[PDB]
Structure formats: structure tokens, C-alpha cells
Paper text:
State 3: up-up-half-up RBDs, 4 scFvs, 3.91 Å. Then, in state 3, the “up” RBD-2 further moves outward to the “wide-up” state, allowing the second FD01 binding and pushing the “down” RBD-3 to a “half-up” state.
The epitope of 16L9 mostly overlaps with the RBM, while GW01 binds outside of the RBM. Thus, although either 16L9 or GW01 alone could not bind Omicron S tightly, the GW01-16L9 bispecific antibody could bind Omicron S collaboratively with the help of each other.
Author numbering:
A (entry chain C): 350 to 620, 641 to 646
B (entry chain G), F (entry chain E): 3 to 110, 125 to 251
C (entry chain B): 24 to 68, 79 to 141, 156 to 177, 181 to 247, 261 to 349
D (entry chain F): 3 to 114, 124 to 247
E (entry chain A): 449 to 498
């Protein structure tokens, strides 16, 4: 808790759905948004901060609260848009040999600024005396270890808590999340949403030789004609859907009522029957 | 508030799909819990945290949390699977909202017993007792889930294993006092301002978490139930 | 050093976007290098100046094997603001936007800087971005937009052993990196692999917002490009989508002489206020 | 709520070995059970804080091992003339008051801190019911603004209980007895630190004690120094 | 008690259609059968005044 | 807030132009004051009200207030004009904002002494004394203009000649008490809540106006300074 990591993760597709099956977590409270909607929001960089506290201290990790750890080791303002993911770790972080490894900085002068790490080891000076380094009656060790033992009960066990702070500064967002991708229907007028490029057409197989860097493709006069599949390399062709004008040939309402219907721009296979120019 | 089909249908051999719809304030921020209750006997936990299952629950049940609603699946149902299915979720407003029930009918070891019921004078009431036998009461939480005769279940109050913060329902707040003691496994619940609308069983349900189910939104569940007393005030 | 200047021929026409075009003429309006401009002839035979980065630069390199490697793009080259120290080491490229100010001098072992601060990108690209009388020319167009730092590159193995100067021939650049880091860049610093234990000379131009008509081949590559405001013939080839202009007279854009001075003449001033008789008296009021 | 023996007078100094049962756990986290010897008149004095390593004092009372689920303070062979009350502290859960025990009469016979830092109070003689009375414990020695002090009240017959806990400079926690009607306000950072009554509800008649150190999360602090209390004497 | 106020309904109302109701609401699918259980009351909330 | 060149330059013989930019809330509604301070000695008034100059200041200096900014001009500077120049203005929000300083370096009778400094214990402090010798203390106002070693100057508090309403800065408000007495020329400034960020000189500056510099926005200035004491708390 006095020296916690600040891993700045960016430039990845953060699949938060996988985090629900990595480890048997015991706390997945996200204050900012819903986990379902989190996979559709881009972010610049996520700050992962991990630490170890007791079971009775997990309640102290909140966006604004006091406590022996909430205002002495790690404080969260009232803007935390991440999660408070935490889980018990009383399987490998507790042996009967003396757990004089951790500490929680029992002594302090005042409340620290939220989102700040204080890596200090100086002797706590309780005023009215210059302590150049001494331990008696005026100045003591401001650090104290825990008493984690395997033969104990829940509430005072090693609980690993990791928060994922989110931020959006004046910088382009790198991490966005998963992106669903369906199959591709060939030789059928359907809709497409290829990398923001939205429209409708008949995705057919083309023989165009695109450059290794080109993705989209236009025509002589401002119209998309062929694009590159974001999946395995395949050159497709986007031709607009089947449309035409309907004309009615009628001999007049004086001898009969039989009429003929002419669909323009069709091959009699996309609407006796005759096919003319 | 949770939406649940009143009574679905189905044939043996195939599978059905029971759903539970809820807003993002309760399901979108917590985990849904599916409970199974046989008609006549005490309820029992079926699916907790939507991903794991207890040791007693076989692989014949599965749950998913796609979106803001929970989906149950029972591959290969039989006559033994004819029971009541309830959905429960802890809302962010310090409350425990239960479902309505699913009458999935198809026509082809620690004891947690409690007592302290009995008909009493309206207006006032008595204390509600509970007990167990060697289950580490200090390291587990307890719930009060009453069930009216013929009606569904609802959560009344919660006591954590630490013995600090406690929570009540939206209607029993103030006039109820839940507490424990340093003696053997026990639980005290004093009721006040009896409005005669309390004809239920008051199940003293055992849980597995330690703190109040508000900070632990992924471990909170409910262990094996216990035989409750039938308290009928009836004014 | 007295930096000389050379006449840059038609070179530096990069692809504005990624769109396939076959046998057409595309009139784009963006940051390009004006044809027949002056480019500094900084010779690396010692030299390491700081250049102003207005909107994009055109860096050249005629190094033999590894003479010119690395870029020190940045805003102030200080520890307060961030910078960019994209380097090309042994079969790898390092792209970091950390705020490493400097150590002693931009020379090169990572002897370019010696410090430690908080970074934003650690792009370690495995594919590197980089015959007796056969040199090698490498052109790099650096452009900065609201949210990207685009770097186009092209490697052409020139053959002629003439005095060091830009050759004759069109050669576009292909995009390879699309760094999405957002940081203001205003200063350009170069550096060479010293390795103490006419060699080479880099050409650095300046991009300008102009219009260019590019011809796309049937394959999908650009064969040539024509400016729009270089000369009346360029204006004619720009206003008409054709590089083969027929014989005759064509009406190009209109001209209008803009004013220089501005006069605002009001009437003579008279009938002054009697305030002068108000603030000068003996008995004023009660 | 803890379990303590009402009295202990048989077999003086041979098999007394008083303790405090009613834990049914492993003392929560930090196994630090303190023992306070409340004496009529002057303020109580600390006897031992851990299970071993007794502080500077009487050396005939040690070996406070945690047997079963209770700390058995070995007091046999101490003396045969004492009139005081032994209280133990446990239940170190997060924000859980009432860590003291009930009145244990450990009189083996029955019949037969002053200049360390400072000891001052307000002297609330004939306190009017209500109003706002301020009680201070100005200490010319240890800093009254950096150490972790507390306020504990006790009434005739009833045992002690935690009434006010305050951290270094960023906590103003109150006990469950007041539930909000008590507002702690720190005085000047270099003069003293006082309290505030804030319209008592006739239950504040007990005498107060401003301790320079915490009770349940007790630290060595060099030495444990207390101060005499004052009688409120409400007239509600 | 002279100024009534209805409560939420499981279905949207219709323009120019009176909403006179006197039954007990059924939360979800659990009929409380007149007696108010949990989340089931009468949509006759009396407006409070001062 | 006033924008001023931190360290300008210049050559002998010709003239330079030091500027001071400010919003219309302080400069647009009041008059800018230019103060000159030699390195080592006490400061002195240079230009007041941007129109007149003191008797000691020769015609070698000039100031203008064209627009919302002030412009200084020194026709024919020499080595004696190598000093620090500060811009000061009274804002309409009851405050006196000073400049930053202009290092115009070129490489080719009533005493107002005060005292009462000295290193003290942090948190608390002592009183700040000031005195003079027959300068009509009743008909003049007093200012507290402290100067940190190496840093610039800033206004702390101001008491009018009437002895009624006084003004404090945005950081010294509340924890400071400035007052006078009916005795000989004196001034008592008590400081409280010492935060160790007070290492300065606390110049007891003499003024010429009578009321507080909020109603007289054209006559307010600052007379000859005085030798101040060096108080260094240093925690
Ligand atoms: C996506 O993965 C499949 C795996 O078979 C591969 O064939 C395809 O080329 C990949 N596409 C891209 C562009 O990553
Ligand atoms: C890096 O440190 C600087 C220090 O001023 C800070 O402003 C910046 O936000 C930090 N993050 C980056 C950009 O690495
Ligand atoms: C362009 O496309 C044609 C298609 O047949 C191909 O033969 C040729 O190699 C490509 N490149 C050139 C050199 O035109």
C-alpha cells in the first residue's frame, strides 16, 4: 500500500468480458459505467494500481472516505470511473514464518493528496523536538507490518485489490475494447459497415490488384466501388443494389385490360418472361 | 424490480430458458443469484455469481449474464426439476430485490433451524431466534428471507460476519433491530410496530461472505437454508 | 557552417489517403512540397542544427550504410514538455514519446539521452524502416495532424554518381507508420552515427498547403503530379482535368489587386464641449 | 459485548489468573490485548499491552498468554493487598467500539503520570443540562496535534467504553452512543486540543478521560500516561 | 386524502382515456392478493400538503 | 495578474520600452504605478498615476497608459538606470496586484525603518513593528509590501490614514490583524497560522493618500520606502 504499481496500459483491445473468468474475484464494483457498455468506449490510457489490504479494509476503498488506509496510503477522489476489482489471496501470501514484509504507514502528519504514492522511510517526528534519527519517547517507526497467518478467519486475510483508473485528456484514445465481426455473404444485396464505411451493395469477388497499404477504394467521380476486407486478405467489389424503373405497356382501356410490366436494368433473375436490352 | 415469467411450460427431454430482466442499477452493477425451492421443503442455492455452482448443484444447470438480464438453462430437465426458480440481486440503493418465481411444471452438514414465531397480539411482537451447530458464525453473514404462505420470498435484513454495519429492507427500516451475541451460534431480531402484514416464515438464511453484501459485489451468495417457524399474527 | 541551398525537383508527392484509383486524375488540396523550391544543403561530412517544424518536413538521406539514423522531433527539447526520439537500431525501430530532455548532445549505444521520466509509448517495431557506385536514397515525409504523426517513407536505389543533388524522376512515398500519439511538435533535430572508436548530406524541406493534380496508374500507383499555382501552364493543367492541354486559350482563375493602405477621414473637429468652463471656477456648488 | 468475571477474591495470589472470555475467535487481527488497572481516585494505569514484553513497572505480573480464546493474565504471586478493577481490551474489528470489559472485582484482600507530560481538564462543576461545554487536556510535552489520542468515559458502576476516536489530522469518527450528537473540534495546532458537548442527552453524566494513546490499536508511545477525570454532574 | 395520486403502471396510458383503478398492483409476477406484501401496494397515494 | 517581461535587455545611448499588460479590471479601471528598486537597497517610487513624477525622479523617465496596458520609456539610459522595474495596480476586487520584475541590465527626509522579525517557532509568529519620525501619520496610509530574497514583491495588507476599514490580500486574509495606535508613529501587524512560506522582508511602505486605495483611484501611490528587517522562519 505504500509502494503500489502504476502500470500505464495503452494500445490494446481491452476485453473486459475476459476479466470475469480470469480469477475467482470477490469484488467487481465499477463506479463509472456499466461493464457491458465499457467494451464500446475508447480510452487513452488505463492506470492499473494494485495493493494488498485486509478484508475489513476493502470497504475503505471508495471514491471519498476516511480510514487508516483510505487517507494514509491511497485516496480516491469523487471522479473514479474505473473498478475496484479485488480478490482474496490467502493461498500463497500467508506462511507460518513471520509476515514482517508488508506495512501500512500507521503514523502520518495529515491526509495525503488523492492518487499519490509516498515512498518514504524517515522516522516520524512528533514535533517539539529535532529528531536526527532516534527511537524513544518522541519519534517512532511510522511503519507497522500486518499479522497475516494461515490459521485465521476471513476479514483479516490478504486481499489483493487492483483499481483501473480511466482518463481522457487532450490526446487520441488508444484502448477501445472488443469489436464484433460477423461473416460475409457473397452475391447478395445486403448492408455493410466495413471500418466506418457504411452502405449497401452486393459484395462480389473482384480481380483488382490493390496496394499493400490501401484499404478503401473509390471511382472516377466520388463513389466507393471496392474495399479491402479487414479479415484475411481478399479483394471484394461493392456494386450498388438492384434498382430500376417500372413501366406499364397498355393497349388502352377500350378493348381489354391485359398489361405488360417492364423492369429496367435487370436480368430477369433479380426482380411469359423475356429479357431485352 | 425484477421481471420474471409467471409460469412457463415445457416437455421432458428437451431444455427450457428461464429469463430474469432487470435495470442497470441492480443487475448491471452486481451479479444475479438463482435459487431453487422445492414445494414443501426449504429453498436452496442453485447458481451464484452467474459463473460458479455449489458442490451439491450438479452440472444440469447453467446461467449467463448477457446484457442487463440473466438467462437460465437446464439441459435435459426431468420430473425432479419441477420446482420454483427465484432471481435475487443486490441493488446499489442498499436493498436486496428478489424475483417473482417460475412455476416450471411439466406433467410428463450444518443445521440452520430457527424458531421464535407463534401468534401474538397485534401492534406488538416478540423476538426472532436462530441457531446453528459449528459453522464459524464469526466468518459468515446471515440474512432474513421471509416467505408468506403461497406467496414469494423477500429479503428483510442482513447481518455481516464482522458485526458492524447492517441493512434492512425499505419497509422494515427503523422498527426492526437485528443483533448477535458473543455466545454460541445465534441471531436476534426484534420487531416493532406490527401492522399485521407479517404472515411469513422468516427464513434465517446462511451466507458465505464476511462483510455486508454491498462492498463484495461478486462473492455474496446464500448457503444452505434452514427449517423456519410459521409465525401467523392474523391480528 | 554556411548552409547552402539546392533546387528541389518534383519529389515528395505522398499518398494523402488509402484509396485505390485506376487511370484517373485526382486534384487534392493538402500539405505538399512546392515544386522547384529551395532546400537546405546541410552536409554531414559535423552538423546538428535545430529546424522549425511548421506543418511537416521532407527529410532526405543518401547515407552509405548507417550514417544518418534517428530523429529527435520535439517541441522544446526540454524535460518539461514531451518529445520524440524515434531511432533505428540493429534490425529494429524504437518509437518513444517520453520526455527525455538530453544528456550532453544528440550523438550516437543509447548515448543520446540519460534520464528517466514518465513515458506514453514504447513502440518497438521489429521490421526496420531502413554495387560499388550504387548509393541509396531514402525520403521521409513527416506530417503532424490534430491526432496523428504520420511518417511516409520511400527507398530508391539511385545509380548515377553525379555531384550530390536531388535526381530527376517522380517517386511517391508509401505509408508505414501511423503513430496516434498526440503531442505538439515544433522543432526538428537530426543526428548521425558518429562511431569514432563527402560522406552524406541530408535535405530538409518545408511543406505548404497547396493543390496538386496526381495521375494514378492502372495498377494503382501514382505516376506523376502537377502543381496548381507554380506557373500559368500548371494553373491550366489544374483547372482542366487533363495533362495534355490542347492548343488554344483557356480562362483560368481571375485576379484582383488587393489594397495596401487604408484611410479613414472624418470631418474637421469643432464645437468643443463647455467642460473646460466647468472644471475651472471658484464657487462650484453645494 | 464481552464476558468478564463479576468478582475474584478466593485464593489471593495463588490461583486468581483472571481473564476475559467471550471472544470465540482469534482476536481478529493484531493480537494486542491490553490490561488497564482502574483505581478509585487517580486515573487508571496500563499494566501490559501484548501477551509478553511487559512495560516498565511491576515485574510480578506477566505471562499473559492467549489460552483457548482468552488472554489469561497470570497474576498469581503478585501481592496480597490490592483494591482496583482489571479491564481487558479485544475485538479489534474495523470501527468497533465498546472494546473494554465489565467490572471485575479482583480485590485479593478488599480491606487493605503526574509529572510525566501533563494532566489537565475543564472541571465542569454543576453543568447546566444542554449548552456546550469544552474539555481540554493541554499537554506541554508530547504534541497535542500529531499523536493519536482518544476520549473514554466511565460512570459509577458501569465499565469503560470508547466514546471518541480521532486520528492524526483527517478523521473525526464518533462512537455509536452519540450517533451524531457529538461534534469533535480540534483547537489550535500548537496550544491544545479540546472537545465539545453539543447539547448532551442526560447520558453524559459519566466522567471523561482524555488518553494520549489509542486503546484497542495501542502503540508503545514510549510510556502510557493518563489524566484524572472530572465530574459533569448534569442537572436535567 | 381528497387529492389522490396514482402510481406506476406496467403499461402506458392512452390519450383521452380515464385511468380509474382500484385494484392492487402486482410487482413482477407475484400476486400479493390484496394484502400488501413487498413492492405491491394500491395506486392511491395521497398527496401530502402543509 | 500582470504580464511583464521577466528579464529584458538593452544597449547604452538609445532608449528602451518596458511594457506591462493587464486586463480592464485592474489597469482599465485604475492607474498603473512603476517602481524602481536598486539591487541591495530599498525600493523607491518611480512613476505614479502615469502622468506625474516625484521630485527626486528626474525627467529621464516617462510612462503612458495607451489602452489597457502601460508603457515605460527611458530616453538616454545609463549605468545608473540598471535596476528592477515593477508594475503595480489596484484591481476592482479589493486587491493590489504587483508585477514580476524587469532585469534591465546593461554591461556597458523622514526615516521609515521598521523591525520585529527574527526566526520564530513555526505555526505561530510575533508582531511586526514599524515607526517613523514626524511625518503626519494621521494624514497618510500604510502598506505592507514584503519581498522574498531573490523573488519579487507583493502587497500584503493596507491600512488607511483614517484608521477604519483596512484590506488584506487573498492569502493573508483572516489570519492577519493590522492596526494602529493613538501614540507616536507606529503600526502593529499580528500574524497567525504560519505556514512557513513567509520568508520576506515585510516593507512598511508609506503612502500619500488618506482613505483606502479603493475610492481614490487617481491619487493612490507609495512614498519613500524604509529599511526593513530580514525575518527568516525556515520552519
Ligand atoms: C485473422 O485471423 C485469421 C486466422 O485464420 C487469418 O486467416 C486472417 O488472415 C486474419 N486476418 C487479419 C487481417 O488479421
Ligand atoms: C508525465 O509527467 C508530466 C510531468 O509534468 C505530466 O505533466 C504528464 O501528464 C505525465 N504523463 C505523460 C504525458 O507521460
Ligand atoms: C499492372 O497491372 C497489370 C495487370 O495485368 C500487370 O501485368 C502489371 O505487372 C502491373 N504493373 C505494371 C508494371 O503495369
Amino acid at each position: 500500500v505504500y509502494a503500489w504499481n502504476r502500470k500505464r496500459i495503452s494500445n490494446c483491445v481491452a476485453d473486459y468480458s475476459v476479466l470475469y473468468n480470469l480469477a475467482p474475484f470477490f469484488t467487481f464494483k465499477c463506479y463509472g459505467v456499466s461493464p457491458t457498455k465499457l467494451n464500446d468506449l475508447c480510452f487513452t490510457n488505463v492506470y492499473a494500481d494494485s495493493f494488498v489490504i485486509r478484508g475489513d479494509e476493502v470497504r475503505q476503498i471508495a471514491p471519498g472516505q476516511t480510514g487508516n488506509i483510505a487517507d494514509y496510503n491511497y485516496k480516491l477522489p469523487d471522479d473514479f470511473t474505473g473498478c475496484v476489482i479485488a480478490w482474496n489471496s490467502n493461498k500463497l501470501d500467508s506462511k507460518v514464518s513471520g509476515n514482517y514484509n508488508y506495512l501500512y504507514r500507521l503514523f502520518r502528519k495529515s491526509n495525503l493528496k488523492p492518487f499519490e504514492r509516498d515512498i518514504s522511510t524517515e522516522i516520524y517526528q512528533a514535533g517539539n523536538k529535532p529528531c536526527n534519527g532516534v527511537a524513544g519517547f518522541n519519534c517512532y517507526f511510522p511503519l507497522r507490518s500486518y499479522s497475516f497467518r494461515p490459521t485465521y478467519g476471513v476479514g483479516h486475510q490478504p486481499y489483493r485489490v487492483v483499481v483501473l483508473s480511466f482518463e481522457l485528456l487532450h490526446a487520441p484514445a488508444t484502448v477501445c475494447g472488443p469489436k464484433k465481426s460477423t461473416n460475409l455473404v457473397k452475391n447478395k444485396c445486403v448492408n455493410f459497415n466495413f471500418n466506418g464505411l457504411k452502405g449497401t451493395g452486393v459484395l462480389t469477388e473482384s480481380n483488382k490488384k490493390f496496394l499493400p497499404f490501401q484499404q478503401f477504394g473509390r471511382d472516377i467521380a466520388d463513389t466507393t466501388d471496392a474495399v479491402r476486407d479487414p479479415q484475411t486478405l481478399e479483394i471484394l467489389d461493392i456494386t450498388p443494389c438492384s434498382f430500376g424503373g417500372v413501366s406499364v405497356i397498355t393497349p388502352g382501356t377500350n378493348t381489354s385490360n391485359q398489361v405488360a410490366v417492364l423492369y429496367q436494368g435487370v436480368n430477369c433473375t433479380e426482380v411469359n418472361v423475356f429479357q431485352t436490352r | 424490480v425484477l421481471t420474471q415469467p409467471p409460469s412457463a411450460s415445457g416437455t421432458p427431454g428437451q431444455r427450457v430458458t428461464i429469463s430474469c430482466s432487470g435495470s442497470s442499477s441492480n443487475i448491471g452493477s452486481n451479479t444475479v443469484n438463482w435459487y431453487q425451492q422445492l414445494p414443501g421443503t426449504a429453498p436452496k442455492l442453485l447458481i451464484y455469481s452467474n459463473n460458479q455452482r455449489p458442490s451439491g448443484v450438479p452440472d444440469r444447470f447453467s446461467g449467463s449474464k448477457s446484457g442487463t438480464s440473466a438467462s437460465l438453462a437446464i439441459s435435459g430437465l426431468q420430473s425432479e426439476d419441477e420446482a420454483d426458480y427465484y432471481c435475487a440481486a443486490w441493488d446499489d440503493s442498499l436493498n436486496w430485490v428478489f424475483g417473482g418465481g417460475t412455476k416450471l411444471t411439466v406433467l410428463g452438514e450444518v443445521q440452520l433451524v430457527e424458531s421464535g414465531g407463534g401468534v401474538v397480539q397485534p401492534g406488538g411482537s416478540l423476538r426472532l431466534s436462530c441457531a446453528a451447530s459449528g459453522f464459524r458464525f464469526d466468518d459468515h453473514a446471515m440474512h432474513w428471507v421471509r416467505q408468506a404462505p403461497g406467496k414469494g420470498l423477500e429479503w428483510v435484513s442482513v447481518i455481516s460476519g464482522d458485526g458492524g454495519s447492517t441493512y434492512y429492507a425499505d419497509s422494515v427500516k427503523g422498527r426492526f433491530s437485528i443483533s448477535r451475541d458473543d455466545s454460541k451460534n445465534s441471531l436476534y431480531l426484534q420487531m416493532n410496530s406490527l401492522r399485521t402484514e407479517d404472515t411469513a416464515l422468516y427464513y434465517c438464511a446462511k451466507d458465505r461472505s464476511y462483510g455486508p453484501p454491498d462492498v463484495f459485489n461478486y462473492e455474496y451468495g446464500m448457503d444452505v437454508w434452514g427449517q423456519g417457524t410459521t409465525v401467523t399474527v392474523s391480528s | 557552417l554556411p548552409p547552402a541551398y539546392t533546387n528541389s525537383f518534383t519529389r515528395g508527392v505522398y499518398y494523402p489517403d488509402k484509396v485505390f484509383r485506376s487511370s484517373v486524375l485526382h486534384s487534392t488540396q493538402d500539405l505538399f512540397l512546392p515544386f522547384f523550391s529551395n532546400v537546405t544543403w546541410f552536409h554531414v561530412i559535423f552538423d546538428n542544427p535545430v529546424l522549425p517544424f511548421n506543418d511537416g518536413v521532407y527529410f532526405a538521406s543518401i547515407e552509405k550504410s548507417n550514417i544518418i539514423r534517428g530523429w529527435i522531433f520535439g517541441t522544446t527539447l526540454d524535460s518539461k514538455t514531451q518529445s520524440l526520439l524515434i531511432v533505428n537500431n540493429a534490425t529494429n525501430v524504437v518509437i518513444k514519446v517520453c520526455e527525455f530532455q538530453f544528456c550532453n548532445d544528440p550523438f550516437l549505444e543509447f548515448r543520446v539521452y540519460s534520464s528517466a521520466n514518465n513515458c506514453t509509448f514504447e513502440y518497438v517495431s521489429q521490421p526496420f524502416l531502413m554495387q560499388g557506385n550504387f548509393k541509396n536514397l531514402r525520403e521521409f515525409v513527416f506530417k503532424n495532424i490534430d491526432g496523428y504523426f504520420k511518417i511516409y517513407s520511400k527507398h530508391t536505389p539511385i545509380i548515377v554518381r553525379e555531384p550530390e543533388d536531388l535526381p530527376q524522376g517522380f517517386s511517391a512515398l508509401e505509408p508505414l507508420v501511423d503513430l496516434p500519439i498526440g503531442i505538439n511538435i515544433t522543432r526538428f533535430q537530426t543526428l548521425l552515427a558518429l562511431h569514432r572508436s563527402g560522406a552524406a548530406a541530408y535535405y530538409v524541406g518545408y511543406l505548404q498547403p497547396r493543390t496538386f493534380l496526381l495521375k494514378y496508374n492502372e495498377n494503382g500507383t501514382i505516376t506523376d503530379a502537377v502543381d496548381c499555382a507554380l506557373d500559368p501552364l500548371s494553373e491550366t493543367k489544374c483547372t482542366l482535368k487533363s495533362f495534355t492541354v490542347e492548343k488554344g486559350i483557356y480562362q483560368t482563375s481571375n485576379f484582383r489587386v488587393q489594397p495596401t493602405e487604408s484611410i479613414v477621414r472624418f470631418p474637421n473637429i469643432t464645437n468643443l464641449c463647455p467642460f473646460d468652463e466647468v472644471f475651472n471656477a471658484t464657487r462650484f456648488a453645494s | 459485548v464481552l464476558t468478564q468475571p463479576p468478582s475474584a477474591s478466593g485464593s489471593p495470589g495463588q490461583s486468581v489468573t483472571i481473564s476475559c472470555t467471550g471472544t470465540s475467535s482469534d482476536f481478529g487481527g493484531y493480537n494486542s490485548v491490553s490490561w488497564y488497572q482502574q483505581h478509585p481516585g487517580k486515573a487508571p494505569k496500563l499494566m501490559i499491552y501484548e501477551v509478553s514484553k511487559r512495560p516498565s513497572g511491576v515485574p510480578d505480573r506477566f505471562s499473559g498468554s492467549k489460552s483457548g480464546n482468552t488472554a489469561s493474565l497470570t497474576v498469581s504471586g503478585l501481592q496480597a493487598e490490592d483494591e482496583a478493577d482489571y479491564y481487558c481490551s479485544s475485538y479489534a474489528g474495523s470501527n468497533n467500539f465498546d472494546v473494554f470489559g465489565t467490572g471485575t472485582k479482583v480485590t485479593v484482600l478488599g480491606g487493605g503520570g503526574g509529572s510525566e507530560v501533563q494532566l489537565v481538564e475543564s472541571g465542569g462543576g454543576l453543568i447546566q443540562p444542554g449548552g456546550s461545554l469544552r474539555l481540554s487536556c493541554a499537554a506541554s510535552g508530547f504534541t497535542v496535534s500529531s499523536n493519536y489520542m482518544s476520549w473514554v468515559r466511565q460512570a459509577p458502576g458501569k465499565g469503560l467504553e470508547w466514546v471518541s476516536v480521532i486520528y492524526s489530522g483527517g478523521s473525526t469518527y464518533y462512537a455509536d452512543s452519540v450517533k451524531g450528537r457529538f461534534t469533535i473540534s480540534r483547537d489550535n495546532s500548537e496550544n491544545t486540543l479540546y472537545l465539545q458537548m453539543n447539547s448532551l442527552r442526560a447520558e453524559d453524566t459519566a466522567v471523561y478521560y482524555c488518553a494520549r494513546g489509542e486503546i484497542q490499536p495501542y502503540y508503545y508511545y514510549g510510556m502510557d500516561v493518563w489524566g484524572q477525570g472530572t465530574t459533569v454532574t448534569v442537572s436535567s
